[PDB]
Design a protein around this nucleic acid. Structure first.
Lengths: 56, 209, 120, 122, 114
RNA sequence: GGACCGGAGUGGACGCAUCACUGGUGUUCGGGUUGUCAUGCCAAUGGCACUGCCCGGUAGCUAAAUGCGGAAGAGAUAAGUGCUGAAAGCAUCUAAGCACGAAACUUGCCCCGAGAUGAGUUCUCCCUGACCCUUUAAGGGUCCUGAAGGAACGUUGAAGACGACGACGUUGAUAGGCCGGGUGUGUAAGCGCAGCGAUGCGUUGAGCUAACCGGUACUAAUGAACCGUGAGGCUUAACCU
RNA sequence: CGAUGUCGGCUCAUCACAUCCUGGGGCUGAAGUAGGUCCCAAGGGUAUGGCUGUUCGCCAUUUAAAGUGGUACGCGAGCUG
RNA sequence: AAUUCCUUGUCGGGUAAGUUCCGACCUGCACGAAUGGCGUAAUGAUGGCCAGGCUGUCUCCACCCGAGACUCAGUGAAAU
RNA sequence: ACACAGGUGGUCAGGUAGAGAAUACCAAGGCGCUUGAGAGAACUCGGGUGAAGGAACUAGGCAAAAUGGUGCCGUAACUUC
């Protein structure tokens, strides 16, 4: 129909050779509570860099 | 000596007392300074190295900053090298600007092209479009034909394809000079040149002339 | 092949964009705080601030400019009785985009857009 | 535009209104005519007070255009519609002995200079 | 870097009239004709406001005798003996391209005299 | 009727680029307009009718607007045209010996080019701590202590499918707002006055402002660590050691 | 003979030269100016209308230029039918 | 000519030329009256020819706004 | 087979616009339809605007465009009147 010979494990595995980027930027930690976040994202406590953010 | 650096700073009119208005392009020269003259024992030619302009202290990295430190504090915009002709040169206190063209009638300009992406084929390679009324079933644009016959089974290197367009060199090689100002670094040239206002460029004397 | 733009295109047509932004700018002066998509909150920051620069006016030709183009039924006077005057000596910068993560389980850039000063 | 098989009026005296251009000429071919282009022309109504025959084939030169003229100045001068004047084979200069419209002082071209030398407004 | 916005102005004149569309201006200019310098005068109505700095063309349409006649001139050009503010035009549009479709008294512009 | 030369005059075919010549397009701008619904009503403002409809157009773009050449020199040949001369006393363009010369060949002109791993040349910048273990040109572990630089975090574009890449993230200018400039449109939107009223006159050469670009601290643009360390394999003659 | 689309065109290219047109040289039955003709030379280059579905072939306009050939007398997993 | 092959036979008309089109000619290869003739008003998803009108079909292309593609996250095929 | 761009007989008939149970906007009343958010590439499907000429396109004005309605005035060849 559309291909000659069932494609090999090497040929299909090639996509895995580009994987080296570290996950979640390795996070940031809050220096006043010890919880983790992304590098400019807000805490679960309604705080950012030791002050109150957003109405909850 | 050297290929002199400047920028396209706008368009103007110079007029005539016969009656014609004459539109022309305005270039501002940033000028070039010497950093070394090289000996005939290297490569088999006498050559010269030149730098340009000044840049703020919050830019340029140490590998380039230390090579600006061996001649001053102005810094930035990198380095150029050229071969010498008809004269022996010195480095101390030496610079060059628009007086380089004080007896030159035609010039040769090299700049950069505007970004256009993958750009396609209709404008890029003049692959002429086809009918949208009468016939031409889902073939409104067809990218030439990549094979000359159906027997070879090959696409050949002597053919053009769609691909990244812009951020590369562009030139005009017969460009006429109108006026220069040795106090204001003005270069006034006939007609228009590649790129919009603020485009960075280099200029040489015309050789095909 | 776009050559220049100054204001996001957005998905859905121009008759949705107009109707949605007048209503959402009304909602922002009616509540002081909104949570919505970041590029759409930047496009909201384009339209809410020229309305606060109008809300300091008193001329017969300005005080009721285009009422049905940005229309409310609760804060119609509070806009000029307090809200426009609250920034009328400031010269720009009336809001904060408040760039945060997540609207659902996947990280789309979110904006908790607010006024630079709030009533309570 | 002005090309082959095209209806083109004449500023030439008793030359009629139904007149047709059949070839644009001057050297290696260029498709279209403007002010100072020579053309091969034919007369379709000729008029009873006329001076050339219905169906005859002769030379003419274009002197009025909707496109206008800019080449010597860079700013355009524009006329209403399109027109020409009839031109001799070997005997030099146009056939018109009175030629209509104000024309232009740029029409001083040595092989056409009779037109600015009859009775122009310029 | 300094000459941005300068050499695109240095060939400009210091005082030239703001007539706007529908006004008349009475322009006088020289020609040389491969022989001798001669003065000539052109009259008509202005069709656009000429607001473009050094790159300001202005367009005048005669439409007083015969058919059409329309000329373009450069605002900052040296070859101009005289230009004036001769007759006012009480028009309510930015462009007068509609006069290509007017004849007789309907092709005249009014000054209002008030 | 009436050539070639290298050197000028002026056009055709072609292409690429400019937006400054003039024109066009232009649903972030202004004016005009038909009908009806909503905003209680009015003065009016909005929705719907493809962007309802027609008239101009900033910014952006663009051809019909506009410019320009594919040349000389240099090197060296082929076809050809020839010299001087031996084999062949002479003769002979050829053998020995030497020329000139083509829309061709190589440069010269423009671009890319050292993975040219044939990894070339030349210059700038940074890192100067020590142990532990094995059957070890393999590595592995930790302490002491971290550079030049790159990315990420971002604000964003004239850079772009996504990546990537220029700009900017404070002795301040990347994007926005706010201001000021500069274009566009064409005389606020109310209030008087003229009139039988559609409408006109006065305030008003007005109003409104966006993309072009000059300001401004007003809004936004983390601390830092991971990658990259602690001087980096071998040898010859002479010197240092 | 278990797919082995048909005429011409539209369409986009590439090789040959027993060279059409261009560069160089000659023979000449060549006075200028052009032809007639062939030795070299492949870097580049060669019709718009009218009739036919057309290619063929005839007529108008007529050549810087409407040469001859190969690639299914190229050219349907592009298009037209 | 839905009828005559080479045949665009033969004379003319219009054309810029015209196997197209029209007026005609008539030793019609293989016109001919109910397996109808010949023709006329009205008539036709009417063939061809000529002109006017308007037109992005074309000359010859250029711009603007919608929905996908492209990025992310949920859901996710077949001939062979 | 499907929360299927399909098919399925009549009745009742408020205001403005219009001749009209065509058709523009709404009342009374009902619906808000089962992937979503950004980006603003080639290449397509669904729309808008084009200056000069002009059918030169094509077998062919195909398609698209202008024109487009109403009442009066006015209206040729030929005719079975």
């Amino acid at each position: 129909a559309v291909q000659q010979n069932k494609p090999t494990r090497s040929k299909r595995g090639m996509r895995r050779s580009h994987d080296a980027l570290t996950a979640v930027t390795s996070l940031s930690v809050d220096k006043t509570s010890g919880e983790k976040h992304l590098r400019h994202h807000i805490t679960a406590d309604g705080y950012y860099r030791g002050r109150k953010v957003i109405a909850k | 000596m050297i290929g002199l650096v400047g920028k396209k700073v706008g368009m103007t009119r110079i007029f005539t007392e016969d009656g014609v208005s004459i539109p022309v392009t305005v270039i501002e020269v940033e000028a070039n300074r010497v950093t070394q003259v090289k000996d005939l024992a290297n490569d088999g030619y006498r050559a010269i190295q030149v730098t340009t302009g000044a840049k703020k202290a919050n830019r340029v990295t140490k590998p380039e900053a230390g090579h600006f430190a061996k001649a001053g504090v102005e810094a930035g915009r990198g380095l150029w090298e050229f071969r010498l002709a008809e004269g022996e040169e010195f480095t101390v206190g030496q610079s060059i600007s628009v007086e380089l063209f004080a007896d030159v009638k035609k010039v040769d300009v090299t700049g950069t092209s505007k970004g256009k992406g993958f750009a396609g084929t209709v404008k890029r390679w003049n692959f002429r479009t086809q009918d949208a009324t009468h016939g031409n079933s889902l073939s409104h644009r067809v990218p030439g034909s990549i094979g000359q016959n159906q027997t070879p089974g090959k696409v050949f290197k002597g053919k053009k394809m769609a691909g990244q367009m812009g951020n590369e060199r562009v030139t005009v090689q017969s460009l006429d000079v109108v006026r220069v100002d040795a106090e204001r670094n003005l270069l006034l040239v006939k007609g228009a040149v590649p790129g919009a206002t603020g485009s960075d460029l280099i200029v040489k004397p015309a050789v095909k002339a | 092949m776009r050559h220049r733009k100054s204001g996001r295109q957005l998905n859905r047509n121009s008759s949705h964009r107009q109707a949605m932004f007048r209503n959402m700018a009304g909602s922002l002066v009616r509540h002081e705080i909104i949570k919505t998509t970041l590029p759409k909150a930047k496009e909201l920051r384009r339209v809410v601030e020229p309305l606060i620069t109008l809300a300091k006016t008193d001329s017969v030709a300005n005080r009721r400019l285009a009422f049905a183009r940005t229309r409310d039924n609760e804060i119609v006077a509070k806009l000029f009785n307090e809200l426009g005057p609250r920034f009328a000596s400031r010269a720009g910068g009336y809001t904060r985009i408040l760039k945060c993560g997540f609207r659902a389980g996947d990280n789309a850039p979110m904006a908790y857009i607010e006024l630079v000063d709030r009533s309570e | 535009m002005i090309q082959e098989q095209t209806m083109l009026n004449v500023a030439d005296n008793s030359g009629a209104r139904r007149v047709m251009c059949i070839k644009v000429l001057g050297g290696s071919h260029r498709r279209y005519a403007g002010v100072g282009d020579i053309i091969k022309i034919t007369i379709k109504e000729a008029i009873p007070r006329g001076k050339v025959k219905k169906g005859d084939v002769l030379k003419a030169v274009v002197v009025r255009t909707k496109k206008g003229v800019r080449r010597p100045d860079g700013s355009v001068i524009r006329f209403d519609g399109n027109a020409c004047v009839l031109l001799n084979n070997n005997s030099e200069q146009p056939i018109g002995t009175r030629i209509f419209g104000p024309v232009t002082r740029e029409l001083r071209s040595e092989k056409f200079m009779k037109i600015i030398s009859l009775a122009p407004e310029v | 870097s300094n000459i941005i916005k300068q050499l695109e102005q240095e060939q400009m004149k210091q005082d030239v009239p703001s007539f706007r569309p529908g006004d008349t201006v009475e322009v006088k200019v020289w020609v040389v004709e491969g022989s001798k310098k001669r003065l000539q005068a052109f009259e008509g109505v202005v069709i656009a406001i000429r607001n473009r700095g050094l790159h300001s063309a202005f367009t005048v349409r005669k439409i007083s005798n015969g058919e059409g006649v329309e000329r373009v001139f450069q605002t900052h050009s040296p070859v101009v003996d005289s230009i004036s503010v001769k007759r006012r035009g009480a028009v309510r549009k930015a462009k007068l391209y509609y006069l290509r479709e007017r004849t007789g008294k309907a092709a005249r512009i009014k000054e209002r005299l008030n």
